[PDB]
Amino acid sequence: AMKIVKRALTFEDVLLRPGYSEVLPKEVKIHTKLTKNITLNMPLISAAMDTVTEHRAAIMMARLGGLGVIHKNMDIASQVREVKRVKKSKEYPDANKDNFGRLRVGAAIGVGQMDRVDALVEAGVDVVVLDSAHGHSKGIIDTVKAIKAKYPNLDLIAGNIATAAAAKALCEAGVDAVKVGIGPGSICTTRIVSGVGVPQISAIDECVEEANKFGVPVIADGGIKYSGDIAKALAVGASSVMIGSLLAGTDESPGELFTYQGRQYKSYRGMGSLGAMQKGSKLVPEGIEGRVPYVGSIRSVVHQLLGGLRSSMGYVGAKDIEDFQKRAEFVEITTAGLKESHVHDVTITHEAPNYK
Amino acid sequence: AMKIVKRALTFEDVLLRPGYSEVLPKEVKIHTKLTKNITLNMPLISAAMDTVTEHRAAIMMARLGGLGVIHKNMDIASQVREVKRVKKSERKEYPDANKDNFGRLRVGAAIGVGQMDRVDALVEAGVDVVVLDSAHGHSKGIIDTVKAIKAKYPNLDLIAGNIATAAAAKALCEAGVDAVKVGIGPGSICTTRIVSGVGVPQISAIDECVEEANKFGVPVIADGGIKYSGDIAKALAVGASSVMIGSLLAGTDESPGELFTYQGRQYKSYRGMGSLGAMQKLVPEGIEGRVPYVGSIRSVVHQLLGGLRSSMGYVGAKDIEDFQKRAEFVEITTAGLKESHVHDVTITHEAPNYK
Amino acid sequence: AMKIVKRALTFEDVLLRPGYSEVLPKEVKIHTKLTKNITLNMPLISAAMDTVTEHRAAIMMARLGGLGVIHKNMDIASQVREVKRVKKSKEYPDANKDNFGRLRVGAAIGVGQMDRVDALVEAGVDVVVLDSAHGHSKGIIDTVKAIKAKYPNLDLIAGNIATAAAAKALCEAGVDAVKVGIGPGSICTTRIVSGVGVPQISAIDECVEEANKFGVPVIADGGIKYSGDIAKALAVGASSVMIGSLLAGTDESPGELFTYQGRQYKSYRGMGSLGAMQKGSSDRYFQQGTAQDKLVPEGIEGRVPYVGSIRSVVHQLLGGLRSSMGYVGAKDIEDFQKRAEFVEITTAGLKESHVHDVTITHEAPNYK
Amino acid sequence: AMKIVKRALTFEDVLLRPGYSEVLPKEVKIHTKLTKNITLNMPLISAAMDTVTEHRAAIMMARLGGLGVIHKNMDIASQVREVKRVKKSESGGIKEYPDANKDNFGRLRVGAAIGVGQMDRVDALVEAGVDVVVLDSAHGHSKGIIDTVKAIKAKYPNLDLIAGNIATAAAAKALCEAGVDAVKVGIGPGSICTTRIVSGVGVPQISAIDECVEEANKFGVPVIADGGIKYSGDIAKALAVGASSVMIGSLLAGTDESPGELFTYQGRQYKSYRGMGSLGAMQKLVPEGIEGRVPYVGSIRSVVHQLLGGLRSSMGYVGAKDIEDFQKRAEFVEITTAGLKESHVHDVTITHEAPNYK
Ligand SMILES: C/C(=N/O)c1cccc(C(C)(C)NC(=O)Nc2ccc(Cl)c(-c3nc(C(F)(F)F)cs3)c2)c1
Ligand SMILES: C/C(=N/O)c1cccc(C(C)(C)NC(=O)Nc2ccc(Cl)c(-c3nc(C(F)(F)F)cs3)c2)c1
Ligand SMILES: C/C(=N/O)c1cccc(C(C)(C)NC(=O)Nc2ccc(Cl)c(-c3nc(C(F)(F)F)cs3)c2)c1
Ligand SMILES: C/C(=N\O)c1cccc(C(C)(C)NC(=O)Nc2ccc(Cl)c(-c3nc(C(F)(F)F)cs3)c2)c1
Ligand SMILES: O=c1[nH]cnc2c1ncn2[C@@H]1O[C@H](COP(=O)(O)O)[C@@H](O)[C@H]1O
Ligand SMILES: O=c1[nH]cnc2c1ncn2[C@@H]1O[C@H](COP(=O)(O)O)[C@@H](O)[C@H]1O
Ligand SMILES: O=c1[nH]cnc2c1ncn2[C@@H]1O[C@H](COP(=O)(O)O)[C@@H](O)[C@H]1O
Ligand SMILES: O=c1[nH]cnc2c1ncn2[C@@H]1O[C@H](COP(=O)(O)O)[C@@H](O)[C@H]1O
Ligand SMILES: [K+]
Ligand SMILES: [K+]
Ligand SMILES: [K+]
Ligand SMILES: [K+]
């Protein structure tokens, strides 16, 4: 018999149970930790993708208390210059700044790009995000040890992983956070192309339990479709959430608006798609090239997302995230329960800002 | 590791098993309790929503044996006027009308937290029951509100909600409510589970809350999620004493709101009270929509109660209390659900109780 | 503290496992029992519906070795006439005949319709089919007892039921077969309108285990979508299968062909639909002349595609069953039930079992 | 009560768990065994179907390191010539095909399908130099198939023989004891197959592979996972469970090299694809397959390239240097319906064409 280790759940499989509450949504606190040494004022990170995060999107994310990660599908000098435009940047009272009062910013790197790390460190990057399709690999782990050995005070994120053993390996190599998510991304085809993946709720749960033994936060990356998934990811034990598709159709993301059959869209594509890899430099992709509807400014998207998190926390009775994770209790639901949860049997006539 | 309390089920996960029957559907009795003191002659309540229940719909529901709950999306003066319009209304055409001791139609009215002024006026207007509703019933504000109301009006029947856990039912019952309303997330226009990730599938929520409310002798109202008459039967069979309905009544003559035509068909607006339009940035927990026009509340109510009577016939139950003692369920699969519905045949004529 | 007895399954939830086979599909025997005293030469019965079985359909079903049940949505004299047309009727070497060489036929009756039974017996009906929405009821049981006391030699089928205790009550009442099916019919809305029903595979299995203790056959009625569901139902322990929608679109069924958007259809409706009940409300109104209570139906009115002769449909259906018994290695229906082993499958396994990822260009005679 | 042996899973019910990896996808080795005595340099076989494999397709499959099985819906002389066209084909290309799958004389390897009782066909295929004969039935666990296996091995002890199709451990034990050199697994999974709908008989493919591998390993007999492969990730799943190779129909039917012509429908190009148990292939009959069409997808080489690239990527995720190491390391999770929708593309309209996903 084959080895089936567990039955794994994703976001749509579970719901949070309400608990006795003495707090209102507008009163809760949504600050969290990005790494062992960097805090966020709100728990959202924009994804490190060339249709999501350059300097315009990163500045707004940090102004709102979160973070943006500049994607690595550009030359070193262009990434340095994008980082510096963020660092050089009453209406944004929750801005996430460093000790010098400059906005905080992240930047993506790959294996074997130490010149890129050197230049981004010199540019004053706050955190380096070492990402890969398979974070639980010798190359990633050796690259972690190398960066940490040369820049001990540089906060370093590594991913992506989906198992507890992977979280142990990365924590023991010296990361300041692990990023969890193999397969959940809206534009990801890894589970279809290679057959590999772990549903995100189970992957978060498995990795948070291990990483907590090292005091290392977990970033939940991929598969967020609604503000409710942010709440579920945080309640299971993640410290922050990375989001791609829900921010790709905003004013601040790179790329221009275009019109298709009467509506406005922006491009949104995986970094492992043919289009992203060919602009960078027969390939076997693990992402698709797509479009998402234009949804206005990042500020209004972020406002609805955190408004859903605040409501969730209010339902559970939690004053802050750590209390949210302590109090959280779940129910596993069925396909019919999912249909009951969504809008059903009623035609929608007006566009809802947090539900599409 | 994360704490998963249970695997929770909703209406379409289960069906009632038939049992030996000596009763006929047209002879069973469908009276029930709304609160500890107020009875209903039939177990349906129209939702406290501004596209469902004002005075016109509240009168029909009461005339047919149930109850209408005036919504709170109006100033205090208008709600008092709506309630008094029901109490003044009224007979061989409505022999099951739900009346009070003075021969007046019974009617309820919705209130929010910290609206004592509203409670005072609806009491002096002769309201039969006050319905304290909130998105989160298991909260300090609701509990204190319950304590404050029952202290000032010990004889005013008070419904509070909405809840989805036994621990929430215990809290409200000890606070002194006369009925609890169960439903976090199941409503047709509700996005709470999607926006916040919080909710409990309705069958499990009812089951859990009734077990705890029964210890205090407190009836449970199953609010939201009803799509077919069979859902009414399952909710009552699980232990609910009554069912509150919105979408199935929004498209009727007696609901507030204009009839309008759209692409050849007539509709009425139907929207959640937590939607942007109802609350007028805001973070809504409902959506604004439309439902097809269906005719009078009377013809809808007739079909829904006919399904309930049919189900009680299949189970062999003479009344709802006997219904709850005899009821046995099976859990079914997705394939079982598809087999339960109409399948492999194109429907060509309208059926009054199936769409 | 709600009471969930079990997790119940239907046809699409299970598949038969193949077994070692020394038999060929064309060689297996598919004779079976309709009641304790009447045999069939193949296990198919056409449904007692006014869009499925009148004398034409019933003649063809008996000629092919099965049985047709004349529906009861007509006055007694009309049902008697339909029965006699069938009794009156070597291209059909498997024809299902009585001791006198006449085609066998069934006829439906309702609670308390003794006058209908007396006329059907006189017409030579071979089996009376006592039908109610709820067979596990005092009205049904009392009717079974009165018919059996008056006509001890008349074979009686009663239904429909879905539980062991229901099968026990009808068997002790004296039926010659029970008919199983609360909710599975293609045109049935009982489970949605009332919330009552049992998934059909579990209903058969539970009822067969109990009815077998009395030696009483089980008729699996409703929910058959493909020839593979006939195989599953018999493998679980049913002795025969009653079929509505797969036979409604045939030449022999009552009703005319009509065209809708370039293709032909026939009407198909539940006997508990508004349309089927309209005629009885019309008789009831003119008799008394009183404003009547509006009906609350448990079925819908629809249409099915035209599929040609009942002969070609039955041939394909029986071909699937013979193929299944070849896969299982079974020489006959009894051997089929002895050898049958199932797997429970997932929703993804159901998609894999159907045609997937390929657009169908020519429609198969046994698959849509 | 009815006997329910197990709850069976298929490809979409499971996912491979990532493991610690020191291997790059480029460096893994994907050779495997077709039978006890014939090796493949990549683990894919083209289906024995009159819309998939004749000589052109079998030539490309062998050039790329796999195998093609000439279908049996033709007279004996026609099948002999199809085999001869492959055996006499140039194996090398314009170092273009460095992984070509050859016999002892440097000729491309090829298979040919046969039915029960067609000994004259077997004799002619042997004389033509066929490398493997594929005795396929709808029901391999039958007395007719067992007897044909015994007759063929008695007359040609050194002819490699595959037999199928089966889906139970008992069926695998039967064929192995009869003397097959590989068993073919698959009752019902095929894209054009209706067996499970027409007869109610079948086993979901992942459980069927798992069950037959565990038995067939006791006899040293490889398992061929036949049918239901929709994506490259399904190939990885079948091998990880223990199958030694994978037989594919629908994904190769729309290629240049498959038999049958291109046609256009509504502005797009298609090739016909049909089950061999469909009415058209068999010419009242009772079919167990349908006739259909699949999109035109270009050359077999471009399809095979993306399929193997997905398996290589899968083995890199698991950390496996070759197939046997793949099967030792592989751990699975079982997922829900909601986990499958999260696995596919969701909430985003696909604009461009993906060579390995649609
Ligand atoms: C995130 C993501 N999701 O698919 C993705 C992003 C960009 C590119 C790719 C491509 C399409 C190029 N796909 C792989 O890179 N696939 C893959 C599969 C299996 C392994 Cl084991 C590895 C490894 N990469 C390394 C690294 F070079 F990073 F060190 C060591 S091992 C890589 C994928
Ligand atoms: C029924 C319902 N379903 O969504 C709904 C109806 C109207 C308005 C809302 C809006 C959109 C305004 N959403 C919330 O009100 N969301 C929410 C979320 C979490 C908590 Cl903890 C609370 C609370 N409100 C109170 C108060 F006392 F004020 F009533 C105490 S606790 C409230 C929701
Ligand atoms: C591959 C395949 N998949 O369906 C298929 C291919 C061609 C034809 C058929 C048809 C449509 C003809 N279907 C059966 O042949 N179905 C079936 C079902 C059960 C058994 Cl036991 C047998 C057997 N036939 C033999 C014989 F020797 F006659 F060949 C020995 S056992 C056969 C199926
Ligand atoms: C098959 C079927 N539906 O599946 C059906 C066929 C015709 C009519 C009906 C209608 C729409 C009229 N539906 C019921 O008759 N539903 C129902 C539900 C529960 C019980 Cl307990 C009873 C009973 N009626 C009797 C009587 F004596 F009156 F005939 C004895 S028991 C009846 C249904
Ligand atoms: O091409 C890819 N293949 C697989 N995953 C990707 C690819 N590109 C980006 N991702 C991941 O998907 C995340 C965004 O997912 P989303 O928020 O659901 O759209 C990113 O932050 C990456 O972790
Ligand atoms: O906007 C809202 N958000 C969530 N729930 C609502 C909202 N408005 C009304 N509800 C609930 O949904 C019920 C109606 O559900 P329905 O019967 O399925 O349409 C009401 O009685 C309320 O309990
Ligand atoms: O209107 C009805 N409501 C519920 N069940 C019905 C009705 N009319 C017929 N049936 C049942 O459904 C069977 C036909 O189901 P089918 O073969 O799936 O279409 C009949 O033989 C009856 O047992
Ligand atoms: O008509 C048939 N009925 C059932 N299975 C078939 C039929 N024809 C071919 N097959 C099987 O289906 C496989 C191809 O499945 P596919 O790769 O999913 O299209 C073949 O290799 C055969 O094993
Ligand atoms: K909802
Ligand atoms: K049905
Ligand atoms: K199939
Ligand atoms: K995905």
Distance D249 CA to ligand 8 centre (A): 7
Q: Of D280, D225, D223, D231, give the one whose Cα is nearest residue D251.
A: D231
Q: Do A134 and D18 touch (CB under 8 A)?
A: yes
Residues in chain C with CB shorter than 8 Å from the CB of D293 are 358-359, 361
Distance C241 CA to ligand 3 centre (A): 25
CATH T-level topology, domain B1-355: TIM Barrel (3.20.20)
CATH T-level topology, domain D1-358: TIM Barrel (3.20.20)
Distance C234 CA to ligand 7 centre (A): 19
Q: Of A118, D223, C13, D197, give the one whose Cα is nearest residue B334.
A: C13
Q: Where are the alpha helices (DSSP H) in D189-253?
A: 195-199, 205-216, 232-241, 250-253
Closest partner residue to C3 (CB to CB) among B327, B333, B334 is B327
Q: Where are the alpha helices (DSSP H) in D156-299?
A: 169-178, 195-199, 205-216, 232-241, 250-253, 279-282
Return the CA Rg of chain B.
Answer: 19
Between the CA of residue B187 and those of A343, B9, B110, B172, what are the distances in Å?
Answer: 8, 15, 17, 22
Token couple for C228: 């593979």
Token couple for D35: 């039978």
> Closest approach of chain B CAs to the CA of C85, in angstroms?
30
**Known active-site residue C63:** no
Instruction: Provide the terminal-to-terminal Cα distance of chain C, rounded to the nearest Å.
Output: 43
Point out the ligand nearest to the CA of residue B338.
10
Distance D204 CA to ligand 8 centre (A): 14
Instruction: Give the nearest chain C residue to B240 (CA atoms).
Output: C2
Residues in chain A with CB shorter than 8 Å from the CB of D356 are 189, 193, 284-285
Q: Do C10 and B341 touch (CB under 8 A)?
A: no
CB atoms within 10 A of CB C132: 17
> Closest approach of chain C CAs to the CA of D22, in angstroms?
34
Residue C271, ligand 4, Cβ within 6 A: yes
Are the C-beta atoms of residues D248 and D44 closer than 8 Å to each other?
yes
Residues in chain D with CB shorter than 8 Å from the CB of C312 are 284
Are the C-beta atoms of residues D196 and D202 closer than 8 Å to each other?
yes
CB atoms within 10 A of CB B124: 10
d(CA A326, CA A16): 12
The CATH code of domain C1-368 reads 3.20.20.70
Sequence-distant (≥ 6) Cβ neighbours of residue B154 within 8 angstroms = none
> Closest approach of chain C CAs to the CA of D199, in angstroms?
4
Residues in chain B with CB shorter than 8 Å from the CB of C269 are 349
Chain Cα centroid distance, residue B2: 33
Sequence-distant (≥ 6) Cβ neighbours of residue B260 within 8 angstroms = B266, B267, B268, B269
Most ligand 8 atoms within 8 A of CB, residue of D73, D187, D192 to mutate: D192
Point out the ligand nearest to the CA of residue A277.
1
Q: At what angle do helices A55-63 and A76-87 cross, to 10 degrees?
A: 30
Marked catalytic residue, from C56, C188, C207, C339: C188
Sequence-distant (≥ 6) Cβ neighbours of residue C288 within 8 angstroms = none
Between the CA of residue B334 and those of A199, B337, B339, C8, D27, what are the distances in Å?
Answer: 21, 5, 9, 11, 44
Q: What amino acid is encoded at B345 in this protein? A: V
User: What is the secondary structure of B80-110 as a DSSP string?
Assistant: HHHHHHHHH----S-TT--B-TTSPBP-EEE
Token couple for B209: 């809350």
Instruction: Provide the terminal-to-terminal Cα distance of chain D, rounded to the nearest Å.
Output: 43
H or E, element range at A15: strand A14-16
Q: Which atom of ligand 4 is nearest to the CA of C296?
A: 11
Q: What amino acid is encoded at A163 in this protein? A: T
Distance B245 CA to ligand 6 centre (A): 8
Q: What amino acid is encoded at D118 in this protein? A: Q
Token couple for B203: 């069958």
User: What is the secondary structure of B313-334 as a DSSP string?
Assistant: HHHT-SSHHHHHHH--EEE--H
Residues in chain D with CB shorter than 8 Å from the CB of A169 are 20
Q: Do B136 and A314 touch (CB under 8 A)?
A: yes
Residue D356, ligand 1, Cβ within 6 A: no
d(CA A135, CA C124): 81
Are the C-beta atoms of residues D339 and A10 closer than 8 Å to each other?
yes
Most ligand 4 atoms within 8 A of CB, residue of C69, C140, C296, C298 to mutate: C298
Q: How many CB pairs under 8 A join A and D?
A: 214
Are the C-beta atoms of residues D318 and D19 closer than 8 Å to each other?
yes
> Closest approach of chain A CAs to the CA of B24, in angstroms?
32
Determination approach: X-ray
Mutate to test the interface with B, among A16, A17, A210, A305 (most CBs of B within 10 A): A17
Q: Of D221, D223, D156, D165, give the one whose Cα is nearest residue D193.
A: D165
Q: Do B310 and C300 touch (CB under 8 A)?
A: no
Point out the ligand nearest to the CA of residue B248.
6
d(CA A51, CA A65): 21
Q: Do A290 and D348 touch (CB under 8 A)?
A: yes
Q: Of C158, C154, C161, C243, give the one whose Cα is nearest residue C208.
A: C161
Closest partner residue to A290 (CB to CB) among D242, D333, D351 is D351
Query: By alpha-carbon position, which residue is closest to atom 9 of ligand 5?
Result: A270
> Closest approach of chain B CAs to the CA of C193, in angstroms?
5
Are the C-beta atoms of residues C46 and C59 closer than 8 Å to each other?
no
Q: Which atom of ligand 5 is nearest to the CA of A286?
A: 3
d(CA A106, CA A214): 22
| Domain A1-356 CATH superfamily | Aldolase class I (3.20.20.70)
Distance A342 CA to ligand 9 centre (A): 4
Point out the ligand nearest to the CA of residue D250.
8
Are the C-beta atoms of residues B285 and B196 closer than 8 Å to each other?
yes
Q: Which residues surround ligand 9, an ion (CB under 5 A)?
A: B 190
CB atoms within 10 A of CB C289: 7
Mutate to test the interface with D, among C15, C202, C225, C322 (most CBs of D within 10 A): C15
Closest partner residue to A2 (CB to CB) among D241, D344, D356 is D241
Q: Of C81, C75, C84, C138, give the one whose Cα is nearest residue C109.
A: C75
Q: Which residues surround ligand 10, an ion (CB under 5 A)?
A: C 188
Are the C-beta atoms of residues B262 and B290 closer than 8 Å to each other?
yes
Omega prior to B162 cis, within 30 of 0: yes
What is the SS3 assignment for A296?
Answer: strand
Between the CA of residue D189 and those of A219, A303, C356, what are the distances in Å?
Answer: 39, 48, 9
CB atoms within 10 A of CB D156: 14
Chain Cα centroid distance, residue C335: 22
Neighbouring chains to C with at least 3 Cβ pairs closer than 8 Å: B, D
Sequence-distant (≥ 6) Cβ neighbours of residue B265 within 8 angstroms = B292, B293
Q: Which atom of ligand 7 is nearest to the CA of C299?
A: 1
d(CA A227, CA A312): 9
Neighbouring chains to A with at least 3 Cβ pairs closer than 8 Å: B, D
**Known active-site residue C284:** yes
What is the SS3 assignment for B268?
Answer: strand
Distance A221 CA to ligand 5 centre (A): 8
Q: What amino acid is encoded at B62 in this protein? A: A
Query: By alpha-carbon position, which residue is closest to atom 4 of ligand 5?
Result: A188
Q: Of A5, A8, A31, A314, give the one whose Cα is nearest residue A191.
A: A8
Instruction: Give the nearest chain C residue to B309 (CA atoms).
Output: C194
Name residues contacting ligand 5 (CB within 6 A): A 47, 49, 160, 181, 185-188, 190, 221-224, 242-245, 270-273, 286-287
